[PDB]
Each structure stands twice: as C-alpha cells, then as structure tokens.
Amino acid sequence: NKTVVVTTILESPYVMMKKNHEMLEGNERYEGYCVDLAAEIAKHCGFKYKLTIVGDGKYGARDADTKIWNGMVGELVYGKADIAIAPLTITLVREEVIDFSKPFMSLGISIMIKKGTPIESAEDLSKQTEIAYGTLDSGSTKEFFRRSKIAVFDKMWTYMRSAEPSVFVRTTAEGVARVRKSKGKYAYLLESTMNEYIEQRKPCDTMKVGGNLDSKGYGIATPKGSSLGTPVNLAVLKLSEQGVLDKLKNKWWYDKGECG
Amino acid sequence: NKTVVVTTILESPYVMMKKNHEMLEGNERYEGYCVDLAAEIAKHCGFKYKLTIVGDGKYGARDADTKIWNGMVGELVYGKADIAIAPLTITLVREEVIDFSKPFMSLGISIMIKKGTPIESAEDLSKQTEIAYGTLDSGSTKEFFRRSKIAVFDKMWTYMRSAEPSVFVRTTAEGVARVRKSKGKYAYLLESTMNEYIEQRKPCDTMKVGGNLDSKGYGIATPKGSSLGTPVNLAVLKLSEQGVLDKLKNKWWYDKGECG
Ligand SMILES: NC(=O)c1c(NC(=O)Cn2nc(C(F)(F)F)c3c2CCCC3)sc2c1CCCC2
Ligand SMILES: N[C@@H](CCC(=O)O)C(=O)O
Ligand SMILES: N[C@@H](CCC(=O)O)C(=O)O
C-alpha cells in the first residue's frame, strides 16, 4: 500500500546509531531492540516501512497553555507518523489520544546510583538533602511524581520541582553522565529496563537499588482509530507467545553485558 | 441502564466464598482481589452489577471438533455474560474473539513443589521420570506446552500428554492437593501469582522454584465490540496509576500471609 512512517527515539539499547552509520542509508543506519521489533512487526503485518528519529528528541507531553503535544506522541496526534515503535509507556492521558497495543515489555520506575552511594530506597532519598535526585523531562516518570498522592512520592516531587540548580535532564544519557560525574551526589530516577541495561555497560560504576516504584508496560502506538492497530496488536501477542520478545530482550541486555 | 452480569471463577484469592455465605445474598456472598476490583471498576464506569460463578468452573478453551467455547470465554462469546473480571490470561486465540483491557496484573508460568523436592528448573523436570508433573485443564498453561516449539517445553508436553495415570487436574486446588499428598512425587505447573499466594498459606509446605517460563498478563474481558470496553480500559489505567492495583495485591497476598 503506502510505506509506513515509523517514529522512534535514540535511546539505548532500543535504537542506537551503528558506529558506521555515515557509511549507511535508510533503516540500515540503526540497530537495537526496537529496530529488530519493527522488522518483526512489519513481516507479520505485511507492510514496508521507514524509520525516522523524533525531531525534538522527546517521548511526549502536552503543554499546559498551548495544549500542543510534543515528541513521538505529537508526531502521531498531528499525523506526521503512522506508528511509534519505541520504549513508550502506556498511561491514561496518552491512551485517550492514541491507540496502544497490549504491552511488549513490562517495567517500573527505579533508582540508579553511583556504586557505594548510601541509598537503598525512595524513602531513603526523601529523608535527606546531601544527594540530589531528578528525572527525565517530558515523559511518564516526571508525571508520576508530579501527580502522586503517595506521601513519599509527593515529598520527592516538592523537593525536585524547586531544587537549584535544576535536577531535571533532557536525555537519559545526561542523567547517567550526571550520576557518574557527581561522585555519589546525584541519584537518577528512571525506568527499570533502562537502569538494568546501563548496569551491564562499562565502566560498570552504576547500580539499580531497591524495588520498583510502580508496575506498567510499553506498547506500540498508532494514531487513534488507525486500521494498523488491530494487526499490530495480534503481531505483538504472537511474538510474545513464540518467545521472540524474550529472545530479543536477552540479545540486547545480557548477551551484550560488559560487566561479567 | 441495565445491571451488568459479571462472570468470574472460584479461585483463591481472586474470588472465594466467605465462610458465612449461606447467611448472605448476592454479591455479599464473595470476597477477594477480583471482588474488590469489580467494585472499583463499577464505581469508575457508573454501572450496577451482579457477580455469577461460571457454570462449568473453567477458564475457557475451544473444542477441536464442535469448535464450541467453554468456561468464562464461552459465557462472553455466546452472550451469557457482559464482562469477565477474573485471573483471565490475555492470549492471541482469545484476543481474536473477545475484547481485553490493558493488563491489571502481570504473571508467568511457574513451578510449584513440595518443600525438599530435588527440582530447581523446568530443565530439571524434563530430564527425569521419578517426579510426575502436570497442569490445569482448559486454560492458558496447558496450551503453552501443547503449542511450544522450545525444546525443553516440547519434551515436557510429549511426556505429559501420554503419562499414566493422568497428570492433568480440573482445578487449581486439586493440583495443590496433589503436590501436598504425593510426598514430593508430583510437581505442579501454574501461574506465578497463584503459586506465590499458596506459598504464604498453611500448612506452608509448598514452594515456587526457579524463574518464570514466560511473561504475560491478565485483563478484563468483554464481548467483542461491546461499548463497555473503552471505559473499563480507562478505569484499569486510572487504578494502576493511583496505586490501587498495588494496594489490592498487598491486601490479598501478603497482608494475609500465614507463613511469616
Ligand atoms: N499492572 C500491570 O502489570 C500492567 C502491565 N503488565 C504487563 O505489561 C505484563 N504483560 N502483559 C502482557 C500481555 F497482556 F499478555 F500482553 C505482556 C506483558 C509483559 C511481556 C509481554 C506481554 S502493562 C501496564 C500495566 C498497568 C498500567 C498500564 C500498562
Ligand atoms: N518511557 C517513558 C520515558 C522515560 C521516562 O520517563 O523515564 C515515556 O514514555 O515517557
Ligand atoms: N489464567 C489461566 C488459567 C490458569 C492456568 O492455565 O494456569 C487462563 O486464563 O486460562
């Protein structure tokens, strides 16, 4: 029919530029979990497709004043892209404006520390000031804290929203570089999937600590009412049941472990 | 509008008869995780409802010859019930004939043993004959093995389908009673959620061993195209984000732990 325009985001190890990408063209420029998943979904649904990186490098949030959606969510809502194949969290506010498959991977919000940081829990973080902590801008983690009615998580948000200098970061890599370079004086709140990946990468100086703060999943997103949604959803379930999702997770997380 | 007829199944601790049920009428007869969830969903969607236990006591499978659906799935498909609020696994074959919300709880297939049984893995089970092992009839676990192309799980199925006497059981309670009463000579394959619940109940003689064999979730099911599906799905996401699902899990699993 028509080539399907896929929006995605540069986020390890879902979508990464191959080291030799300036030598490559089109879909061949990229590798990772979501690059592989896109090729599986496409095969099972019978479409040809083009991968594109979201212009603003964001997941998706709605401006309070303009009410405009940014990121991959905005690309779907305003008709710039036909499908999002990315670590995109299923949330109530997003479900209302886009379609999502059943989840292809489960996760929760988690804590990342530099090795040796005296912190074991979110409750530990909330009761101290010496170690700063923050989250990614324009995604589900920031919103979880902003919206929470649970005491510990409200205390956290009150602190983070007024901390100087800013505790918030524009990309996952900035958050990680901040943990590494702050000598245990910054902790980062990020999704368990990303945290477990980073923990198995050189220089092997970060760690996931304590249990997850919530339980949720990523799904494949389509514009609301798109005829793509039904076969994409059946494709996610078939790959789940065939053990292909588990095979891909092991490929990109633990087969590529550098820390033992 | 009309009172919504809910199908569910007697399965601990999702839906259980209160000890004093012969003194009680209607929805008051029952307690558990899914009894509580039904009351939350109903409040958030603005409907009145009646709980009913599935007549044949089954989850749902399709006969190879007649192609008739049994269990709760059959109740939905043939229009006997308006909604299923139960530990009902989201699978490809079911998604095709009924509607499902996003998952309200995640699980995987797991192994239950009598304490002291020399078994740590599915691979351990497959390489021996002394200890029998089986699954529930008419659900997702049996079908996982019947359909699997993974060597270890195919070896398992080849054994189970021809074992004498039968390794299969009609209810979870039969499976558990068989583990308890077989002196370590039977192991039971069941969902991790049910396994972890039983492990915290007297006489505290069973255990979950090894990692889960797959990763999946339960969802709330509606007849295909029902106008109930959309608000029910938004209700599951809101309760997730409010921490109500986590609150209910702790209530029925670990607050009621009898083994420490
Ligand atoms: N509460 C949950 O466990 C829950 C989720 N649970 C899961 O994602 C578990 N889960 N559920 C499924 C599926 F539903 F069978 F598709 C799969 C997985 C993981 C592996 C792929 C298949 S996603 C999600 C929630 C609540 C908020 C909305 C997003
Ligand atoms: N997966 C998240 C982004 C990462 C985060 O917020 O921690 C989202 O879809 O917004
Ligand atoms: N939750 C399963 C039933 C239990 C099992 O198969 O282990 C189903 O919906 O079929």
Swiss-Prot record, chains A, B:
Extracellular side: 118-260
Keywords: Cell membrane, Disulfide bond, Glycoprotein, Ion channel, Ion transport, Ligand-gated ion channel, Lipoprotein, Membrane, Palmitate, Phosphoprotein, Postsynaptic cell membrane, Receptor, Signal, Synapse, Transmembrane, Transmembrane helix, Transport, Ubl conjugation
One Gene Ontology molecular-function label: extracellular ligand-gated monoatomic ion channel activity
Regulation: induction: Down-regulated in the pyramidal cell layer of CA1 in the hippocampus by global ischemia.
PTM annotation, UniProt: Palmitoylated. Depalmitoylated upon L-glutamate stimulation. Ubiquitinated by RNF167, leading to its degradation.
A GO cellular component entry from the record: endoplasmic reticulum
GO biological process: cellular response to amine stimulus; cellular response to brain-derived neurotrophic factor stimulus; cellular response to glycine; cerebral cortex development; chemical synaptic transmission; conditioned place preference; establishment of protein localization; ionotropic glutamate receptor signaling pathway
Record-marked site positions (Interaction with the cone snail toxin Con-ikot-ikot): R62, R146, K238
Disulfide pairings: C204-C259
Residue numbers bearing the Phosphoserine modification: S148, S182
Cell compartments where the protein resides: Cell membrane; Postsynaptic cell membrane; Postsynaptic density membrane
Tissue distribution of the protein: Detected in forebrain. Detected in dendrites of neuronal cells. Expressed in the pyramidal cell layers of CA1 and CA3 and in the granule cell layer of the dentate gyrus.
Positions bound to L-glutamate: P87, T89, R94, S140, T141, E191
Major location (coarse): membrane
Keyword Repressor included in the entry's annotation: no
UniProt comment concerning the protein's domains: The M4 transmembrane segment mediates tetramerization and is required for cell surface expression.
Subunit architecture: Homotetramer or heterotetramer of pore-forming glutamate receptor subunits. Tetramers may be formed by the dimerization of dimers. May interact with MPP4. Forms a ternary complex with GRIP1 and CSPG4. Interacts with ATAD1 in an ATP-dependent manner. ATAD1-catalyzed ATP hydrolysis disrupts binding to ATAD1 and to GRIP1 and leads to AMPAR complex disassembly. Interacts with GRIP2. Interacts with GRIP1. Interacts with NSF via its C-terminus. Interacts with CACNG2, PICK1 and GRIP2. Interacts with GRIA1 and SYNDIG1. Part of a complex containing GRIA2, NSF and NAPA and/or NAPB.
Other comment: The postsynaptic actions of L-glutamate are mediated by a variety of receptors that are named according to their selective agonists. This receptor binds AMPA (quisqualate) > L-glutamate > kainate.
Physiological role: Ionotropic glutamate receptor that functions as a ligand-gated cation channel, gated by L-glutamate and glutamatergic agonists such as alpha-amino-3-hydroxy-5-methyl-4-isoxazolepropionic acid (AMPA), quisqualic acid, and kainic acid. L-glutamate acts as an excitatory neurotransmitter at many synapses in the central nervous system and plays an important role in fast excitatory synaptic transmission.
The name this protein goes by in its record: Glutamate receptor 2
